[PDB]
Design a protein around this ligand. Structure first.
Ligand SMILES: CC(C)CN(C[C@@H](O)[C@H](Cc1ccccc1)NC(=O)O[C@H]1CCOC1)S(=O)(=O)c1ccc(N)cc1
Lengths: 99, 99
């Protein structure tokens, strides 16, 4: 698809069997998902943005279906107010910015 | 151009004759730039990011060149870890996300 930016670029994702809405975010290095459980070992990480830093749990080798495309990579889970799909997974679905 | 997302989508912008670097950020509703004086009057705005809310100075109808493309619109000035070009100006330069 070609997604216009008049509105937030929101897509349906599927992660750990759960359907969620997430923002396609070229400004985010890594994918960050609102608090949930994910299988596997995790390690703590700090990520910073507007308003400062939050501590998240970093899970590797996580599969997410993004708008019907399967991608695999690191998924951070923490007290983010929005689900964001970051560049680490955007690349895997072949997403680009065009102007 | 077409911008892939393997690296941060950082571009040069020009605002009041000064060159700055900024992040093309589809996850950002608004455009926020680090402290600088802009002409004219400003008004208060609160914006929320990953770590909570910050207060910014909102200036309207500001002329800005983004990666060679002219935009005229709202620029928020305040403590951000990186200059971000948000959807309000991404739409003016004709940017779309594609996959
Ligand atoms: C601020 C940029 C540089 C960094 N973030 C991405 C941005 O797209 C961020 C995403 C977001 C949207 C809504 C609520 C909360 C977060 N938008 C954002 O702050 O919108 C503000 C700025 C102007 O308009 C409103 S991030 O969320 O901090 C982040 C950092 C690291 C990782 N790994 C993932 C995400």
């Amino acid at each position: 698809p070609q997604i216009t930016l008049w509105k937030r670029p929101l897509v349906t994702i599927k992660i750990g069997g759960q359907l969620k809405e997430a923002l396609l975010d070229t400004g985010a290095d890594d994918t960050v998902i609102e608090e949930m459980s994910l299988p596997g070992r995790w390690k703590p990480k700090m990520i910073g943005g507007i308003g400062g830093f939050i501590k998240v749990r970093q899970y590797d080798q996580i599969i997410i279906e993004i708008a019907g495309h399967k991608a695999i990579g690191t998924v951070l889970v923490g007290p983010t107010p929005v689900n964001v799909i970051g560049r680490n997974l955007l690349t895997q679905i072949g997403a680009t910015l065009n102007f």
